[PDB]
Chain length 221, copies 4
């Protein structure tokens, strides 16, 4: 768990965890090109590595005869990892998001020089998820909305391009998160306004917290 | 005052104090369904408990013969509690708001794990009260306003639904409090603009103070 | 300089200094009702008190024979105080603003319980002065502007009421200072936009500084 | 390197470095009056001074026979300084921006009384560069945009004045940087919106960092 190979491959599993975290909601809510397997099987490769690797107990160091820790990993958590590593409504691919638990246990690797990028990227991930939810709402809530008005802000009532309908949603989520509100996008229906209240509260929370933290990092530097 | 029964029932009296604080202004300014008695009488139950409970003096511990502290509670404060616990213009139900004093004396119970939720909920309560005031103003100031323009933002000039006319007011109060100002709602008349100056000042005060406090809590964690 | 009479009268001279500071620019830029003399002569009363009062030197305590300190006050600063206390273009009444120097020397009186109100009131004074400047600009810059558009936001192209044309300017200055920008007021001409850049910079400076200070006060409490 | 002449002339080279940093992008992206030479040759004057001046080694003090440090300056960095000091597409004048490196090595001169102005001026420089980029985008992205709409906000579809088309861009960059968003300017096309996301992130970063720093300076004072 501390070899150069283990270290670099763990950095790589974080990289591909970021990859899946940013590419599963996108194609899960926007698209209803063969790079899937190289990571869907890399995760079970990681599972087997977790089987064969070395580990430290509550006070026991790394031990030989590597069979004692497999049932221990299964007793700690393996079912969630397994259902993560499993390929009409095939929406269950969203369970792949459980790969986030992967970066919950190994934070001793990354916990100043990297935390800044990590905070900016988690802000970006939060923005991505909220833009995904906003697009889901603006597409589901049909019998006037915001997509109707985007259809006139850009002269494409048919249907605007998907790059446009995603970049605008990301723009709006950054607007509401960073408390600017340019006004070209404006929640107008009732579910929109309730989501806007929710996102304003979540902004006042997270935009304040992570940026107090980044100011603390700057001061520590 | 320190039994498990006393503790849980005090948490419950805080819960129902939040209940009344959030449900009296609402139906007091928006509505001019039998859950009233179960708390209006629970408050006088609490009064009798305050009579029969045990208490500590300036330096004296809890004493037997529980009759010495009743007149002492009456000398400290009982008239406000009594007029709180009392059922043309029956607007006097707003005096029920005095139940807030109930959570003024027992803050040693709640003063980190709960203070975060308490701060978010007091921000929500402030938002609720200011949205109530805004609705009162937008309904009273008649001979052009903001409700007139909401009648066109949502295609309902008659009268919009009460859920709509409340969710928009809460949306606007969160907007002005968190300094975003999406622009779909816009104070346009003179009393509106004076209220907007007042709320901008109260925002610059409270939005700054409570969030400095929440950043301090996060740092302490 | 330390009697109860001196103390209360100094608090009163601060009160009337606030009075003149908030009522000279207003009627100096908006109005081109006999309460003027009671303070214009109270200032020279204060001058005579400064003559007759007691004072402490660099190391010398209060001395008898009160004639040694008059020429000393005249050597320190008396000409500015005199030209302050003096009644076609009589715009020179703006020199009365020099009464602010009066509260520059006596800050040891007020320097926590009062500093909060003092900071809120100096924010209000800054808002007042900037709204005065904004009204001066919107009235002078004539050959499309913002007053033209206010004439349609409120159905009064003639001329809107002075209370309206002042409350809107104060609203806009609070907007730009507290970084909300509701959008009902919008700088559109070139001098307007240059003033807006200036006020945005002055906001980013002062709104940040005074509110860091008020957070520090809250933390000290 | 520590004479009064050296000190004042170094302050002057910082002044003219600010001059070139603020006047090269402007005329490099807006203008496609003989004050150029007096500084373009002053920079190579500075080069010769760096040749002839005195310097301190890792531990060696200033030494006589001033020929040992010339090749050392050439080994440290001279090619970038030389290509800085060198006069169809003559866009290579943007390489003059490398004069910023000049104020990278001599920060021990300026590192409280001056840092405030320096921070305000670097915020102004960032605003200038971003307004330059915004103008470049709004002029290049042709086959609806923001300049089209400015052509109606100010009644000049032809072409608006260059002072107007620059003061508006600086206004918008201050808006997006200080998180106000008055709404008179509104990104509407796709490249505009992507730039807006980028600038909102860069705002949330720098507007927070430099103003935490200015609050720290105020507290230190
Ligand atoms: K804002
Ligand atoms: K805004």
């Amino acid at each position: 768990h501390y070899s150069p190979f283990k270290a670099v491959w763990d950095w790589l599993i974080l990289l591909l965890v970021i990859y899946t975290a940013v590419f599963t909601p996108y194609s899960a809510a926007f698209l209803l090109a063969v790079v899937d397997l190289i990571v869907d099987i890399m995760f079970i490769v990681d599972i087997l590595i977790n089987f064969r690797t070395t580990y430290v107990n509550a006070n026991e160091e790394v031990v030989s005869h590597p069979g004692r820790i497999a049932v221990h990993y299964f007793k700690g958590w393996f079912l969630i990892d397994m259902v993560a590593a499993i390929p009409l409504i095939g929406l269950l691919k969203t369970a792949r998001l459980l790969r986030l638990v992967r970066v919950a246990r190994k934070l001793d690797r990354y916990s100043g020089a990297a935390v800044l990028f990590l905070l900016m990227c988690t802000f970006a991930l939060i923005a991505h998820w909220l833009a995904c939810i906003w697009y889901a709402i603006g597409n589901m809530e049909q019998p006037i909305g915001w997509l109707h008005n985007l259809g006139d802000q850009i002269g494409k009532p048919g249907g605007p391009s998907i790059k446009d309908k995603y970049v605008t949603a990301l723009y709006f989520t950054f607007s509401s998160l960073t408390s600017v509100g340019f006004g070209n996008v404006s929640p107008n229906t009732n579910s929109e306004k309730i989501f806007s209240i929710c996102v304003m509260l979540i902004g006042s929370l997270m935009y304040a917290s992570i940026f107090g933290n980044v100011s603390a990092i700057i001061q520590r530097l």
